[PDB]
Design a protein around this nucleic acid. Sequence first.
RNA 1: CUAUAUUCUUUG
RNA 2: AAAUAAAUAUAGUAAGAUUAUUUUAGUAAAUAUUUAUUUUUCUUUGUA
Lengths: 168, 97, 142, 55, 90, 149, 442, 187
Amino acid sequence: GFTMKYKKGTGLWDEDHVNDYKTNRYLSARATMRWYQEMERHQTRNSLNARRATQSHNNNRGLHHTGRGAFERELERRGVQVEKYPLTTTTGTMRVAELVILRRMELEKRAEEALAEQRGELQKKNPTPSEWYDESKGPLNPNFLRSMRSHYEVDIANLPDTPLIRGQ
Amino acid sequence: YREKTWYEISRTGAFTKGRRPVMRQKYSREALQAALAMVPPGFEVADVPRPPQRILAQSEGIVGRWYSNYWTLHSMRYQCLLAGVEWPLGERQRPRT
Amino acid sequence: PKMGCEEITRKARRVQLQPTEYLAQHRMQVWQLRFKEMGPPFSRVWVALGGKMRRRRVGRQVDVKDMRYYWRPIEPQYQRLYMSRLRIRDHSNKLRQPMRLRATNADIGSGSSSIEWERASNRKYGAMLAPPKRQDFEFRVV
Amino acid sequence: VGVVGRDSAVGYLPPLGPADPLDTIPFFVHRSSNGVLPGKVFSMHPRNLMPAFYL
Amino acid sequence: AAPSAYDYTEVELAPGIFANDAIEGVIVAARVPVPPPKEKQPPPKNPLERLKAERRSYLARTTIQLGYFPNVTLPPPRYETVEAVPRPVH
Amino acid sequence: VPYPIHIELQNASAESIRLIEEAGGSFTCVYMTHEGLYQELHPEEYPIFMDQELPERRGLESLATNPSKRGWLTRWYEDSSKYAHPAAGRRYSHYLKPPTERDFPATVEEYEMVKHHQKWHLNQPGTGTLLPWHSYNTADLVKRAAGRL
Amino acid sequence: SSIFSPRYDWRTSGVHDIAPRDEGDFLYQGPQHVLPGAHPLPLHHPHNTITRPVISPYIPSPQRSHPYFTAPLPELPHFSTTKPIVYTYGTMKERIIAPVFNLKNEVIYTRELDPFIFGMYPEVEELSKNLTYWMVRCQNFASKWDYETREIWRKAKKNWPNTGMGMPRVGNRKNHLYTWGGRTKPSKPWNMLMPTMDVKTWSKSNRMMLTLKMLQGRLQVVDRLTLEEPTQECYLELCRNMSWDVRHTGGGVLFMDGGSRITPSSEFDRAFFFGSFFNGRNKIVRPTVLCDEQYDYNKTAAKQRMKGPKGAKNPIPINRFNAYDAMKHDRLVITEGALMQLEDELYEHKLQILPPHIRNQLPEYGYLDSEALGDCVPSLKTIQMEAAARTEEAESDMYKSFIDNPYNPWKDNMDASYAVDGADGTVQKFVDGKKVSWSMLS
Amino acid sequence: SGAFGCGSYRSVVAGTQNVPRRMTFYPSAYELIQLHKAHREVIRHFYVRDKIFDNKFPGNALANGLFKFVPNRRENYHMRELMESIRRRSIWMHRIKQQREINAKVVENMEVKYGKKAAASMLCFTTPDSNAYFAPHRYQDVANSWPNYWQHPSVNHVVPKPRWRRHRELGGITRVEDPFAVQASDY
RNA sequence: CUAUAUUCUUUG
RNA sequence: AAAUAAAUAUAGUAAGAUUAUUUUAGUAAAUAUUUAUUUUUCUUUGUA
Ligand SMILES: NC(=O)c1ccc[n+]([C@@H]2O[C@H](COP(=O)([O-])OP(=O)(O)OC[C@H]3O[C@@H](n4cnc5c(N)ncnc54)[C@H](O)[C@@H]3O)[C@@H](O)[C@H]2O)c1
């Protein structure tokens, strides 16, 4: 019947638009891997079967596995473009991705030096912490002050028992 | 053996051509021109009556003698209207009393 | 059904999902021929005409005869009684409101406006209540 | 005529701001996305079509 | 296709510093030299961690080059022009 | 209505129309077959302008060709539709092309029937054209009984 | 039992052996004595900062509206929000600025969070809707199957006639009364409800959960989630070096893996993704708080061989963000790619919510500048979306000479003539006396 | 048909005079939203039509080159979902590009009639509470719009200030030194 | 209820 | 007609069962659930 075939691949990721009613709250370390196996084999099984069925069916009808007949067979010999809208091929869609990535990596070199150019410059201005260091309103976190230690020239994490207000 | 049971015989939307495309490939310009070039001269579109509802609506693409197929004829006509290809054949006539 | 049962260990029947009734099943047309409902939201009469008519007209009087040509609200028991058949689509949905006699435009459009129908270009924006498309001048069902 | 305060036969005006300054209203009320003011009149137990209402 | 429209897309490298502030001084993504595909690593010089590496998971044995979508760059074709390809006999 | 509005809807009430027109606005009463609705609400689906049906008969009487509702076919009615064929006689007026040349009924049986019709109904001007004695009582042929013009 | 019922108060003696354990037990010293565990409020989880360490600038206090930076601090680089910030209904109405952590656990540049996302102030009914959705959804619905009266396999005949015996009146005894029997109306998957949940509610509830994680000071923002190798001990090396507690007993980490500031991805980082299966309490989820609309193609009864549940046939998949797995794992680790993607998908949503006298000022303030129209230079997108975009940049050239061109449809309107045909109702388009319009096929 | 700003086909047949309209300045702010989320959509169609497999488990790894869509389906997805989405986006673009042509004219007419200052001051949509939605720190003394109404600086006096002290002997625990209130337990 | 009454009126 | 195998026929004048105390408003017309009205006096009144 009508099970919404057109929404099958519509989803952004591989795991959606799939009726998954066999599941649990907590998924273990290998149940999660099982889940990620099930989903991608749900896509792959259903795609490869739909490839096989039509390739076999096109072969049984005496034409090319594509569904591309004798006429279109002649057009490719004569060098004629055989269809109206030549959609991007596999190799193309891989190439896009890698060119995008190869832009991003270069940019992540340049940003690295940019930020390292700034950070050393506003460290030399600030050996002492600014007006965020005040716990007048509420206590500082020693969990976080161990992380902020490196920038400053002083010992931050040594905190008096008494609350410190604009402490020196 | 029943290759299609009563329910999927009952659905005439799939079978008949209402609101449904019956030719699923779309040809480029120099493809359409070659396809039109294989039509024998002295052929009118008006000589190809639209088949009844009983007959399934389908198009085998461009095969030999594709102009005998009604739906192929007119689907090709639509691509020729989109691509700006001149249509050599006639057009469908409406006879009246 | 116990891990000992000779009953269940030999398979007999397997029960399926049971089909639901027509959503409009209870709006029966013998009501829709007789009455019509009139009202502002939250108060609505069902109104009908009187039968004394088609047996003896003559001899009685003109006033008692034309007391028959007025629309009149049905007795409230009967209205509740007929309305009750329209209330059985959702029990325990207290936030709902009963179905009307004649389907309004919202109630026609509600069945095509879902996110399950949005790809169906049949039956969209109402179809079956419009007159049919002129068929191809050579159209024939044989 | 100005653009914000235009003539409208229905009548609609963007919020005018507080009628007195130097004073703070403890609450703030948002118009809807269509410009409607928040009060909604429902019915308590709409299934039986009770005349009893609320806001 | 020469520089793409998106090659001018704005990213903030450092606050107050944009990648479009360099302008050609713009990164054209297709003109970035493609690194050659890395295959699986050669087995270590030692039998022990060779056997232990061979003992690993199929997931841990996945070679990583790009890291995203094709993991390993595809090699460029032998011809830079589409009609530069020799046409055999049909 | 303070500002002018230009709007295309179907079957507006008279007061709404005069309220729009007083402002210096516009109203055009479009009336569409179902296909028309789907083609306006989903324009993207159809690349070329496609041949669109005229709405049906009763709707053409009451809406599309109505100057009061300001339908869109009023020009078409006042230019093309309201005139008969240039050759056509009075009896054959409604036909697209006159079926015969001579306006006089061309069959002796049809002539006998027209004589009987003209003595049936008494002799009124329109009696020449045969109208059948029996009716449909169907809603697709009925028009307005009485109302403001 | 119940507090009122007389069964309560039983066992007047014997509940405690009267004698101390000589290791753990002690006397109450006095008012100067600090008792382990004792607190004036009803804490079902009495965790302090030592057991469940919170990472934020300040320990959350009633004086602080949120435990993060309210102003960009002069000693670190400050990155502004990806999209411009608008304050909607439930938003905190105060500037939320969070530090970013490197993978070496030092603090790196500071980044401003979006109060529409991380500021939607939690109220409990919404989170309730979220939680009940997740716990009803996450059952195994295939296990709800049970036998029924017609499913028993006995003889259908009256087993003894009811006339003269003192025996009960019994026939076809496959009923629910009997030890071998089955019920009249049993439970079984196609009768079990799977709840439908619309995007508005999911979006709102997840926003409020993120905000709740901010207010509890348990939110962490990281550059990348990236491992040297796909192996597990690299992952544990990471979790150990930057102080994530992944032990089952300890409070876990909930990852939103986005890529980085510069290169965000919708897909997980492969290297990190394979190392991320540790047996402990941790979960890696998709970088989205939205959800696809849930469609029901049996809403009436129609398809009977459906096994299924009754309800939405498109339940939210398990690797999304939710209330349950937020409440289980304490630290919420969000990559900046995830931040960018969240803001990107929620932008239009927040714009529509605003009152109309406010949405009119959006273009004036430059909120609505659009790359498509080309008033600005295009914005930062993910890897996949840049791929798709360049794909369309590439394929826009095949539609030029065709009349069905999407990028210039109906260019022929304002030179066009229209002609009403009277022989059969049709309105046909004409240009230069040629009929342009296409009569539809059936 | 309709769907642009000009008019439908049945007004051309109707011959209604739509041409000399009065031009007013309408920011077209709603359409920019719809355009943002249309252009957001088109790209998604291009992405999900162009998925190809990368399978990370070995059993499913025989398919890793192929598109996730069957070609026959990928074509149909290109016709039905994708290239008509471009048309929707296209329509929004047209309806805005008309109106910048119109708004330019309104601005010029008002610049001549008024002068740049007066004109630009009239063509501003500023509402007195626009600071409530944009920079609330300028709005705080006007109304209390916070979800925390007890932490707004006007009502801030209500929340208590504890006297708290850290403890080394408890392990870095901060603790409030305030005495508890004795409670009513009995009647 | 079905038939005969077909204008504001009429049968079993 | 008998036996064997399949069904869920119907049974308020045939019937029988129906699973969790310490409770918080009364007795068409009645009763029950949800809900509504501060309509005038010396006191009093469950009306809808
Ligand atoms: N109810 C309908 O008939 C209906 C509904 C929605 C859309 N449409 C659109 O109406 C137009 C024609 O409909 P029809 O039924 O008269 O013919 P059709 O669509 O049944 O057949 C048209 C022929 O031209 C092909 N074609 C369609 N779009 C094409 C394109 N954009 N480029 C190249 N070839 C294309 C079709 O696949 C087929 O080969 C098409 O845009 C169709 O999609 C029609």
